[PDB]
């Protein structure tokens, strides 16, 4: 009876997105045993929960089903493909092959690229560290891009800044989160002088509340290193921002001593000043 109980779950998850497109995050609910006639897919407000008792059955079902598709052992509809890859990646976003299928679906015109940015976002609320999710996301963004960037781009760039920041907050010193955020500024923003300055401002408060986060502070360094490169009146404050940074760093080292991140940060800011 596991062939029907599990195939119902992928519907319950699919249904949840159609009756609530404003889902904030996903999560696992402690359940050693199922209850009578209740779906393990329980949602409260925006949150989407999955009871743990079904996971050991739900995953290998969808897992093997996708493998049968890739090996041409069992056909699936393009609507079935989207449904299974969705539930599969919510359980394990590191499954590269599952992402690749969605790449094919997107590239065939079947799947809307926006759905993958959304799917990736929900996966990062339970797996903010997941390398493949970021890797795939870069491909999706690369497909959405076929002098100042357009309004459409800036709308997406601001979105990427927020998901990178939220992922940076869920896992301490999230390299893959900040590395992606940098990638966005390189390819999407094309190192825009305005966006670089705004990111330098919005992250000041965050950086002061995460002093042991070398990745977050390197992001600061990247902004500064890129600003120097772009300048090859707004561009005048180049030593001014550098001394603002060394003051901000000192103001934290004095407040919070014993953090080699803060020291490594200042140490690198000294390098930028001396090499102008």
């Amino acid at each position: 009876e596991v062939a029907v109980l599990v195939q119902r779950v992928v519907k319950d998850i699919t249904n949840a997105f159609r009756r609530n497109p404003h889902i904030d995050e996903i999560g696992l609910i402690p359940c050693p045993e199922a209850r009578y006639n209740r779906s393990p897919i329980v949602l409260v407000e925006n949150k989407l929960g999955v009871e743990s008792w079904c996971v050991k059955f739900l995953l290998p079902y969808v897992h093997n089903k996708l493998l049968l598709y890739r090996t041409r052992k069992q056909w699936l509809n393009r609507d079935e493909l989207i449904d299974v890859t969705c539930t599969l990646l919510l359980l394990n976003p590191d499954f590269t092959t599952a992402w690749n299928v969605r790449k094919e679906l997107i590239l065939s015109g079947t799947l809307n690229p926006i759905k993958d940015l959304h799917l990736g976002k929900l996966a990062l609320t339970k797996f903010p560290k997941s390398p493949e999710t970021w890797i795939h996301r870069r491909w999706v963004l690369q497909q959405l891009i076929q002098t100042i960037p357009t309004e459409r781009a800036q709308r997406l760039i601001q979105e990427e800044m927020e998901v990178c920041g939220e992922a940076a907050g869920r896992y301490p010193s999230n390299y893959n989160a900040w590395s992606h955020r940098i990638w966005v500024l390189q390819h999407l923003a094309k190192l825009d002088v305005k966006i670089l300055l705004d990111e330098l401002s919005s992250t000041k408060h965050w950086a002061s509340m995460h002093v042991s986060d070398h990745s977050g502070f390197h992001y600061r360094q990247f902004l500064l290193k890129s600003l120097i490169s772009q300048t090859v009146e707004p561009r005048i404050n180049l030593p001014h921002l550098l001394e603002e940074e060394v003051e901000f760093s000192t103001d934290l080292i004095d407040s919070y001593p014993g953090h080699e991140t803060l020291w490594c940060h200042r140490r690198h800011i000294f390098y930028l000043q001396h090499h102008l």
Partner: protein
């Protein structure tokens, strides 16, 4: 200073026999859930398991034929090898497959010429390498490319001179390396790049003092190493850092005894194997880099390991693949 505190009742001796039993009994208990969860990297998983067994001289306890058949089934029409049957090919698991076949001296089980073609087709105009046909650029893939080709004796197939140019363009001012130009320095990424430059004979492009300094800063008062500033100590990082140090010729700067005590403290006296930190979950991943880490430190009960390929020096001597390191 975030760090661990090594206890007195913590293991202070090498439990070689219990490690071999752990890897041998790994996967013996059928669990469909955990199998699917990790199948996306199963090929590398085998490589970790086999390599750590051969380092302890227990490779014969592993099902040779069953694995060789598995690898043949994982090669695709494009030449690339996937992590497992059904999964899509990738450069990572192509390397792992070749590494396994080199351990078993069964390199002709798969189509070598097509593997070369697959790897060659991943290179870009700037010398960079993609993970697969979807174009993810990373220095890991630069390393995986040349490491795979070196084991096949087909390093000439790619634009070597241009590949070196891209990797060197990822070198930051602190001496370290990232995944892409403009990335935060990462010990793991440094291992890939230093491993790359070792294979491509370009170690003279590396400041051994500067980089070696950055790497030694990873060592914490507990003795363990991390991957970057203000990170917890990690057994796997005790490989990425140590191997990099050995490559650039600055291994003697490290604190052998204190680091060795940390790695040994990550053992499980009951089950066996290594965890990332003392009192954590063990896995074949950290088991390998723990053993390989002790091997570089000079543990005599373990076969000498090559810092570039993470394989026994005995195996790489057989295929005449031993890149020069900094003396």
């Amino acid at each position: 200073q975030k760090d661990v505190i090594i206890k007195s009742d913590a293991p202070d001796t090498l439990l070689l026999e219990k490690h071999a039993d752990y890897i041998a009994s790994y996967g013996s208990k059928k669990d469909d859930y955990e199998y699917c969860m990790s199948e996306y990297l199963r090929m590398s998983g085998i490589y970790w398991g086999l390599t750590v067994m051969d380092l302890m001289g227990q490779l014969h306890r592993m099902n040779r034929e069953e694995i060789l058949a598995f690898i043949k089934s994982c090669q695709h029409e494009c030449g690339g090898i996937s992590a497992s049957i059904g999964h899509d090919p990738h450069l990572l698991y192509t390397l792992s497959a070749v590494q396994i076949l080199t351990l078993y001296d069964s390199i002709n089980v798969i189509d070598v010429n097509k593997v070369v073609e697959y790897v060659k087709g991943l290179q870009k105009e700037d010398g960079s390498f993609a993970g697969d046909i979807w174009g993810e650029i990373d220095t890991r893939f630069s390393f995986c490319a040349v490491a795979t080709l070196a084991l096949l004796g087909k390093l000439d197939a790619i634009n070597v001179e241009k590949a070196i140019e891209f990797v060197l363009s990822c070198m930051n001012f602190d001496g370290g390396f990232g995944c892409r130009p403009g990335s935060e320095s990462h010990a793991g990424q440094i291992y890939c790049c230093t491993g790359f430059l070792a294979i491509t004979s370009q170690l003279h492009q590396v400041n051994s003092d500067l980089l070696g300094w950055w790497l030694c800063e990873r060592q914490l008062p507990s003795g363990g190493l991390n991957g970057r500033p203000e990170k917890l100590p990690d057994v796997c990082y005790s490989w990425w850092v140590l191997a990099s140090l050995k490559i650039i010729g600055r291994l003697h700067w490290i604190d052998r005894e204190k680091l060795r005590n940390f790695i040994l403290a990550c053992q499980d006296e009951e089950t066996g194997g290594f965890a990332d930190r003392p009192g954590d979950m063990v896995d074949p991943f950290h088991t390998l880099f723990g053993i390989a880490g002790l091997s570089l430190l000079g543990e005599e009960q373990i076969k000498p390991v090559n810092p570039v390929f993470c394989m026994p020096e005995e195996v790489l001597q057989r295929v005449n693949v031993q890149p020069e390191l900094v003396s």
